[PDB]
Amino acid sequence: AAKDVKFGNDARVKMLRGVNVLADAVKVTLGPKGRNVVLDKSFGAPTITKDGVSVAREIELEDKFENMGAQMVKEVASKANDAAGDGTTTATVLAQAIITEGLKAVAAGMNPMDLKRGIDKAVTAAVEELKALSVPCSDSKAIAQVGTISANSDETVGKLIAEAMDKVGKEGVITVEDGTGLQDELDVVEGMQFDRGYLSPYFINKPETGAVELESPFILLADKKISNIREMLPVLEAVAKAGKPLLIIAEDVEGEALATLVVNTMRGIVKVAAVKAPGFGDRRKAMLQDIATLTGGTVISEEIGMELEKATLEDLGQAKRVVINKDTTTIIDGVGEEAAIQGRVAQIRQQIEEATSDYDREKLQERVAKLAGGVAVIKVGAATEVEMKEKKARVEAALHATRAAVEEGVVAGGGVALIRVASKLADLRGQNADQNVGIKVALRAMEAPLRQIVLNCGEEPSVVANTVKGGDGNYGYNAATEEYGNMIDMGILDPTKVTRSALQYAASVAGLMITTECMVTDLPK
Amino acid sequence: AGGGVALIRVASKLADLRGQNADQNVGIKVALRAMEAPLRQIVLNCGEEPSVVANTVKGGDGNYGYNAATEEYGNMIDMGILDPTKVTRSALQYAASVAGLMITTECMVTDLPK
Amino acid sequence: AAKDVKFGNDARVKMLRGVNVLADAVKVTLGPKGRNVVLDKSFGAPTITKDGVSVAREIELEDKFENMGAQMVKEVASKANDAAGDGTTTATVLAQAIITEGLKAVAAGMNPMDLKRGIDKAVTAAVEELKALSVPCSDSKAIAQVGTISANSDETVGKLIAEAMDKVGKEGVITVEDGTGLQDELDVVEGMQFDRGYLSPYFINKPETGAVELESPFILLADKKISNIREMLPVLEAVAKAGKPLLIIAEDVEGEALATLVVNTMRGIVKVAAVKAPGFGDRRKAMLQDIATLTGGTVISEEIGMELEKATLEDLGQAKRVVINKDTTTIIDGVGEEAAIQGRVAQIRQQIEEATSDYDREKLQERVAKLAGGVAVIKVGAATEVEMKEKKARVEAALHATRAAVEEGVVAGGGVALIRVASKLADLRGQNADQNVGIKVALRAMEAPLRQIVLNCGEEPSVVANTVKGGDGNYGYNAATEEYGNMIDMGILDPTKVTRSALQYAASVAGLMITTECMVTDLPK
Amino acid sequence: AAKDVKFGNDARVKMLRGVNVLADAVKVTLGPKGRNVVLDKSFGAPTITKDGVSVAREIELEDKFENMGAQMVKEVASKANDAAGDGTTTATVLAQAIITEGLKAVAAGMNPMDLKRGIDKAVTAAVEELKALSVPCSDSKAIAQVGTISANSDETVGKLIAEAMDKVGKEGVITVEDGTGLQDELDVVEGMQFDRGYLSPYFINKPETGAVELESPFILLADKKISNIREMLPVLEAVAKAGKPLLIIAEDVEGEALATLVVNTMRGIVKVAAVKAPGFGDRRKAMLQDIATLTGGTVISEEIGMELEKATLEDLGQAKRVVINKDTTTIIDGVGEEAAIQGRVAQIRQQIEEATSDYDREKLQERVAKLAGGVAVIKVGAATEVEMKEKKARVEAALHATRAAVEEGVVAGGGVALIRVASKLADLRGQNADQNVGIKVALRAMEAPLRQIVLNCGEEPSVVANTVKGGDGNYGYNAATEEYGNMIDMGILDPTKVTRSALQYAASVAGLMITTECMVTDLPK
């Protein structure tokens, strides 16, 4: 209906002022000396937290425009978390910094399109100057130190992780279950994991992690699209019995039978979830077959004349547990006998011999790895339910950030990482003044994360920063101890992956906004 | 020659075209000066005075234009900057259709703001 | 009483918005393709003009602050006119240009104090790059061409001037009287001129020129300060008779007898005017003596026991006409007999022989020059009163601008002068970005004057400027003909002095304003 | 004080809307089928008239700007009347026409400065195309027909004029006095007339004509400026006796003794009036001498040592009547004896023999003419006071318009004159479209005057115009008879001088306004 449209300053100041809220309202839970943000709840008591993520989710403004802004940068930062395991709070505070100075420039008479390049250059450079500091993390000794710092100095964790990776390689699968009663457990089981997520939220039964979890469920393997729920019934009812939930893996599921299951397992009538099959094309119909052998089931395709109506509970796959992120599935321990599995491996092991191309080769070594190096399972320790559910968490967080260190290393955390990088590129230049500025902006805006935590401590950031700059190396300022030194030795660091993601995604958005001339939203009625 | 020149080119030749009464000669000048738009615009999305870039593309001939991306002139065709003819035509005609109708409208009838 | 006080943006935007009026309301009467500005009068018909000066005088805003700004820049430009003979309209439009971009900068985050330096450097440089183009004007042939272009191609004028300067040196005195009936007249008379102005306006009887004029007046020469009007009466009454006005030259005249005469010759009771004696110290009491011999009178000092009460009409000086600018007096043809004058010269001619220092020398060659090379008098031609009063004007304007060419040459007028200069200094830099910008601002702001006249012609300035830049030399754009070429040959030029003054004074102000943080005015009540 | 300033449309629409009143409120009293305009008076009854001049005087609007406009065009039209003897109403309606279409153009996107030229060309052309139709008026037969039509078909007048011109040449002086009792009288007396007006209004004792009249007054002839009223007393009192008024002729009279007499003859204490002497320079001191011999008095200059204090009533000039317009004096019958006058002529008659130049010659034949061909005096007829004062008027109006016919002929009046001219110049063109339009505008705007009178008759002007155009020659439309034919034969015509003046002055103004971008007036407080 009748829209409202704004251009120029207006269209932007709204965006700015709009993000300034999302920012200012998160840049406090920053660091160790971070403050509390109270998030009013409806029924019950307010929620008091310092989790910059939860504080974000609850942001949404009145003025349709301001909101629009604050709703974009909000949307991008969320991506950093999706990749690394943290940073979103950082991203957000970075973005704010660029945008604040960017728009301060644009409106001063400089070209937007250049300021965007100057910025992207200054970044593309700093992203590498950053890969410099990156200090490897390959030996299972250093892996321990990481997980140990991610669990708040709990040595028990660090080891647990290291012991796990040393069983399936730092490129393997790792899951965390619940404990059976004190004494941490660890063992390897036939499993798998592919890059597919849930088809729609709601299936979500654990809004804490933001994913789904089904125990001893049944799996549906059918090659084709599913719209007519009718095809389901003969199986959705054979699965109402035995009282076990169901997982759906097929070419896809559209609006009909989709919005159907989204409601049935919503009232509590047989819980089910679905996700697109793996990959596409001709290799799709093959990968899907592995999952079948892996879970003692059968593939249901139309190419051989099989219908979803003529399928009992025997033709279904089955495992002892499965998880499914926003964009990541993962099967744990399947019924498949080590006979048809070790044999399916032999068939694929030969597919590599009759290899005629490099591509055909790659996608085969991948298919095997996931199928032979099963999955790692860590059952957290214990001593009372309350403590068990707390360690479980610190483990996931640790394991996570660890993985991301193994990949691109780790670097002087706590805000230095950036001030360091950005202190070298002081000579970087572009083609026109309007681009040189697009840079200075991007640098001065990396001094933010630190300058902030130094502020959540009532200590003049003006200085603490100036001083961290007046040196070199991993020399930083420890937020907690209020004394300087080597940030790495002091145990203050973040995987490199994240300090990067946060710097890039922040840049992405800020850019777009600096190069925006028009906004179109509904009318305040 | 795409990227806005196509038009400025054509419209630069027809500088002698005339009609029957002043009120028609003007109906022309209007239509020409309005073809210098598309270019004059992209030249604006680059913060470069369109006033000039246009004037200069006019002060020549052939497929000589201004490359928006490179910020340097030359042969628009060689430089890989072009649009099928069909389109640069369609757009010029349909735009004309409408504008016409509106310029020859004396009455509008719509529901009441309630 | 209760003041209102503003700081920061506020204090400035008011100033800006305040000058934007004074500017935008004068930058139209610019050039040959200039428009008309109507200045409402009370009783009678509106005044229609294109004289950017008259349009200024009538500017004064409501909002005490906006007015404050517009009232400063207004005050400085007026100085250009005072020195050269034009430029004020230019100064004003220049000022606008700097300030508009300066404040656009300050408020963008740059240092004010630097922007001021960057600007002043960019100027101090361009001022010389300008003395380059300056093409001399010493031979009485080129002098003619100037006066001729200042009189709108009237050769008769150009000659008149040249013939005049060739009688008292290009460093002499020149005045324009009224004609006696066709046929231009020219002759030399015993006179003098010193750097002193009226003590207060009002004495002004010709608000057109803005000065005072007294015919066949009496002169008062007394060495001392005058506060008690009582001392005057014995002479102010001997001067009510004979019906001639009176000129006062004494050490000074303070609040008492001053605000006294300011009112007496206001009602029409004996017209009088006063001005500080010449120079100061010991040489003051001497210079003043020359004026006496020069005008057949006597000096009245307290050092010999002379009182202002005991002075008849015989002890008074007398001439046939005197003028007195804002800061310039000038005596024309005095009663002094060529006996005591040619003798006073002989006395001073020797003072130079017994010269012991370079200073003592200088101030003696000056005293003689003014006393020996009397004054030039040009009685304009005729043929009806209406035409006579029109040529008289074109002569003053011409003579004026000429003088200013003789001093610092002439240069490609009509806005090029500047675009030229400012096109070379493209490499000029300072110490910090915030100073480099203080420059770019000052250059881009010199392209204004032209960019404007090109606008009073409906021709895209964007181009006409770009094109005048894309060359070199005195190559410009003729506003009148709408065709390019050599601005000098085409007869389009302004004395160098002025194009300088206007650029400097404009700079002065803009500077101050860019370095202002507080404004203090009365309350809107 | 605090001014208000407007630019662009605003500055103009105000002016337009402002004139539209002055116009619309006068363009009705136009022609023979003209309507009545009621002009409220304070004390008494409203004034009902059709004299577009009187209706103008009483216009002055509220909105400072609209007024400004309506006050300019109002001021220029008044000039037409000053030269010719009519037209002001026409000028005003012309101006309106140009301005209305001009600004309609400017604001449409065309250049103002061009539109002004296009217009001025179209005029400069039409002004001549007009000198075509101009049909001579030299023979005392055609002169009669003119005066006769200017007196509303009263043959008696026409003759009176003709008989008068035939006594002092169509280049002589003619005045209208009051009658002595029926039977028109006519005779020649020693008099003179120069181009000088009253120094300030108020002296005006007959606000009907707008001039001054003194019977059997004394005259003051003094060569010099007069500021100190003191110099007067010894004579202003010798003139209080004898009870006769006084006329002042001197180099000039400034602020002092001026604002002095302006008040003394205001309370009724001895009526006096003053006017600048004739011409300037050296010939001024001579012309003034004639006036002396002419009026049996003596010249009072400072060059021979004469003071205004030492002058009785014998040294004063004297005549039997004098008149003084806005810019025209005129002496009637002086005491000078035909001895010193016929002798002064002989002295000047020789000045011509010893003639060395063409200029010196001219100004001598002029001095004699005015002095030898005295003045004509027409004492209107009678039969009751009321009718006598009515004929007197019709005579002045007639005599006037006649003079103006003798000079530049006469042409098809009643609005055709213009439509005719403007119908030929249909091919006239300029340099750019924006100038061709500046023409079309100026032509279509000449069809106004007619188009209007045709409207004050409820007859579609659309046609009557179209039809007068569709022919040629002096073929027009008679407003009164409502039938066409030869406008000259039908007795419908206006001196050429006026139809010109009105077309030019109207153009002048309209121009200026079309080329105005700024207005500056006081604040509505």
At residue B107's C-alpha, the angle toward residues B101 and B111, to 5°, is 115
Host H or E run for residue A176: strand A174-177
Of the candidates A341, A323, A324, A340, the one whose C-alpha atom is nearest the C-alpha of residue A332 is A323
CB atoms within 10 A of CB D344: 20
The CA distance from B67 to the nearest CA of chain D, in Å, is: 31
d(CA D281, CA C249): 32
d(CA C211, CA C226): 23
- Distances in Å between the alpha carbon of A154 and those of A150, A397, D411? 8, 13, 116
Q: Which residues pair with C192 in a beta bridge?
A: C331
Contact at 8 Å (CB) between C59 and C22? yes
Contact at 8 Å (CB) between C438 and C117? yes
Q: Which tokens hold the place of C1?
A: 């009483």
d(CA A271, CA A198): 14
Q: Which amino acid does the sequence have at A395?
A: V
**Dihedral class, residue C182 (left if φ above 0, else alpha if ψ from -120 to 50, else beta):** left
Determine how β-strand D475-477 pairs with β-strand D484-486.
Answer: antiparallel
d(CA A226, CA C248): 112
d(CA C524, CA C186): 57
Q: Which tokens hold the place of C32?
A: 């040959």
Q: Which amino acid does the sequence have at C79?
A: K
The CA distance from B57 to the nearest CA of chain C, in Å, is: 13
B46 and A CB contact within 8 Å: yes
Contact C39 D112 (CB under 8 A): no
D233 and C CB contact within 8 Å: no
- The technique is X-ray
CA dihedral sign of residues D217, D221, D227, D232:
negative
Of the candidates D338, D250, D252, the one whose C-alpha atom is nearest the C-alpha of residue D293 is D338
Q: Which residues pair with C319 in a beta bridge?
A: C334
Contact at 8 Å (CB) between C329 and C196? yes
Contact at 8 Å (CB) between D241 and D268? no
d(CA A12, CA A514): 8
Q: Which tokens hold the place of D200?
A: 């300030």
D459-464: long-range contacts, CB 8 A cutoff, minimum separation 24: none
- Residue B37: is it exposed, middle or buried by C-beta count within 10 angstroms (0-12/13-18/19+)? middle
DSSP assignment string, A396-419 = HHHHHHHHHHHHH-EEETTTHHHH
Q: Which tokens hold the place of C96?
A: 């606008």
Please, what's the largest Cα pairwise distance for chain D? 75
Of the candidates A228, A273, A223, the one whose C-alpha atom is nearest the C-alpha of residue A252 is A223
Contact at 8 Å (CB) between A126 and A46? no
Contact at 8 Å (CB) between D308 and D222? yes
d(CA D170, CA D163): 10
B84 and A CB contact within 8 Å: no
Residue C136 annotated as binding?
A: no
Residue appearing with tokens 């978390």: A81
* Residue D229 DSSP label: G
Adjacency order of strands within the sheet including C212-214: C212-214, C322-324, C329-331
Of the candidates D393, D404, D330, the one whose C-alpha atom is nearest the C-alpha of residue D157 is D393
Contact A101 C109 (CB under 8 A): yes
Buried b (16+ CB within 10 A) or exposed e, A130-149: beebbeebeeeebbbbbbbb
Rounded to 10°, the helix A496-514/A385-408 angle is 80
Contact at 8 Å (CB) between D58 and D22? no
CB atoms within 10 A of CB C512: 14
Contact at 8 Å (CB) between D371 and D341? yes
The CA distance from D383 to the nearest CA of chain C, in Å, is: 42
CB atoms within 10 A of CB D94: 29
Q: Which residues of D touch B32 (CB under 8 A)?
A: none
| Cα-Cα end-to-end distance for chain A | 10
Q: Which tokens hold the place of D323?
A: 């008149």
What is chain D's alpha carbon radius of gyration, rounded to the nearest angstrom? 26
Touch between chain C and chain D: 3 or more Cβ pairs under 8 Å: yes
d(CA C401, CA C396): 9
- Distances in Å between the alpha carbon of D27 and those of A84, D66, D77, D334? 85, 18, 13, 45
Runs of H (alpha helix) within D412-514 = 416-424, 433-444, 448-453, 461-469, 496-514
Q: Which residues pair with A5 in a beta bridge?
A: A520
Contact A105 C108 (CB under 8 A): yes
d(CA C442, CA A380): 70
Host H or E run for residue C219: strand C218-226
Determine how β-strand C493-495 pairs with β-strand C484-486.
Answer: unpaired
Q: Where are the beta strands (DSSP E) in A242-367?
A: 246-253, 272-276, 300-301, 317-324, 329-334
Host H or E run for residue C247: strand C246-253
Q: Which tokens hold the place of D217?
A: 């007054």
**Which parts of D are annotated binding residues for ATP?**
29-32, 50, 86-90, 414, 478-480, 494
D137 and C CB contact within 8 Å: no
- Residue D142: is it exposed, middle or buried by C-beta count within 10 angstroms (0-12/13-18/19+)? middle
Q: Which tokens hold the place of A497?
A: 């992956």
Q: Where are the beta strands (DSSP E) in D278-368?
A: 300-301, 317-324, 329-334
* Residue D431 DSSP label: S
Determine how β-strand A300-301 pairs with β-strand A218-226.
Answer: parallel
Contact at 8 Å (CB) between C44 and C107? no
**Cβ-proximal residues to C347 (8 Å cutoff; 6+ apart), any chain:** none
Looking at chain A, which subunits does it touch, using at least 3 CB pairs closer than 8 Å as the criterion? B, C
Q: Pick from D1, D68, D231: which is nearest to C38 by CB?
A: D68
Q: Which tokens hold the place of D440?
A: 């079309």
Rounded to 10°, the helix A88-106/A496-514 angle is 30
Query: SS3 for D402?
Result: helix
d(CA A214, CA A193): 15
d(CA C260, CA B88): 83
Q: Which tokens hold the place of A329?
A: 């599935």
d(CA D475, CA D483): 11
Contact at 8 Å (CB) between D54 and D207? no
Q: Which amino acid does the sequence have at A185?
A: E
Contact at 8 Å (CB) between D410 and D494? yes
Q: Quick one: CA torsion of A248, A252, A256, A260, rounded to 10 degrees?
A: 20
Of the candidates D496, D512, D491, D439, the one whose C-alpha atom is nearest the C-alpha of residue D87 is D496
d(CA C148, CA C399): 10
d(CA D107, CA D105): 5
* Residue D408 DSSP label: H
d(CA A100, CA A518): 18
Q: Which tokens hold the place of D350?
A: 């020789």
Contact A104 C109 (CB under 8 A): yes
Buried b (16+ CB within 10 A) or exposed e, D408-441: bbbbbbbbbbbbbbbbebeebebeebbbbbbbbb
d(CA A331, CA D13): 80
d(CA A230, CA C115): 76
C-alpha neighbours within 13 Å on the C-beta side of residue C44 = 6
Contact at 8 Å (CB) between A373 and A168? yes
Q: Which residues of A touch C108 (CB under 8 A)?
A: 104-105, 107-109
Interface size A-B, in CB pairs within 8 Å, comes to: 5
- Would you say how long chain A is, in residues? 525
D256 and C CB contact within 8 Å: yes
Contact D282 C38 (CB under 8 A): no
Q: Quick one: CA torsion of C200, C204, C209, C213, rounded to 10 degrees?
A: -120
CA dihedral sign of residues A25, A29, A30, A35:
positive
Q: Tell me the backbone φ, ψ of residue A189, rounded to 5 degrees.
A: -130, 150
CB atoms within 10 A of CB D33: 16
Of the candidates D71, D52, D49, the one whose C-alpha atom is nearest the C-alpha of residue D60 is D71
Contact at 8 Å (CB) between A92 and A56? yes
Q: Which residues pair with A223 in a beta bridge?
A: A301
Contact at 8 Å (CB) between A226 and A253? yes
d(CA A374, CA D229): 125
Of the candidates C192, C245, C188, C247, the one whose C-alpha atom is nearest the C-alpha of residue C219 is C247
Residue A29 annotated as binding?
A: yes
Q: Quick one: CA torsion of D443, D444, D450, D456, rounded to 10 degrees?
A: -150
Q: Which amino acid does the sequence have at D220?
A: L
Residue appearing with tokens 């995604």: A505
**Cβ-proximal residues to A63 (8 Å cutoff; 6+ apart), any chain:** A14, A18
Contact D359 C182 (CB under 8 A): yes
d(CA A36, CA A38): 6
d(CA A398, CA A117): 36
Interface size C-D, in CB pairs within 8 Å, comes to: 106
DSSP assignment string, A47-111 = EEE--HHHHHHT---SSHHHHHHHHHHHHHHHHHHHHSSS-HHHHHHHHHHHHHHHHHHHTTT--
Adjacency order of strands within the sheet including C185-189: C174-177, C375-379, C185-189
Determine how β-strand D410-412 pairs with β-strand D493-495.
Answer: antiparallel
Of the candidates D240, D233, D247, the one whose C-alpha atom is nearest the C-alpha of residue D203 is D247
Runs of H (alpha helix) within chain B = 5-13, 22-33, 37-42, 50-58, 85-103
The CA distance from D136 to the nearest CA of chain C, in Å, is: 29
* Residue C431 DSSP label: S
Q: Give break positions in chain D: residue before each, C–N beyond 2.5 Å.
A: none
B52 and C CB contact within 8 Å: yes
Q: Which residues of D touch B22 (CB under 8 A)?
A: 436, 440
Residue appearing with tokens 């409820």: D458
Query: SS3 for C43?
Result: coil
d(CA C160, CA C396): 11
Buried b (16+ CB within 10 A) or exposed e, A243-266: ebbbbbbbbebeeebbebbbeebe
**Cα A209 from chain centre:** 11
- Residue C432: is it exposed, middle or buried by C-beta count within 10 angstroms (0-12/13-18/19+)? middle
d(CA C426, CA C442): 11
Residue C295 annotated as binding?
A: no
Residue B83 annotated as binding?
A: yes
Touch between chain A and chain D: 3 or more Cβ pairs under 8 Å: no
Q: Which tokens hold the place of D83?
A: 């030269």
Rounded to 10°, the helix D88-106/D433-444 angle is 150
Within 455-484 of C, beta carbons closer than 8 Å to D belong to: 456-458
Tell how many helices (H) and how many strands (E) occur in chain B.
Answer: 5, 2
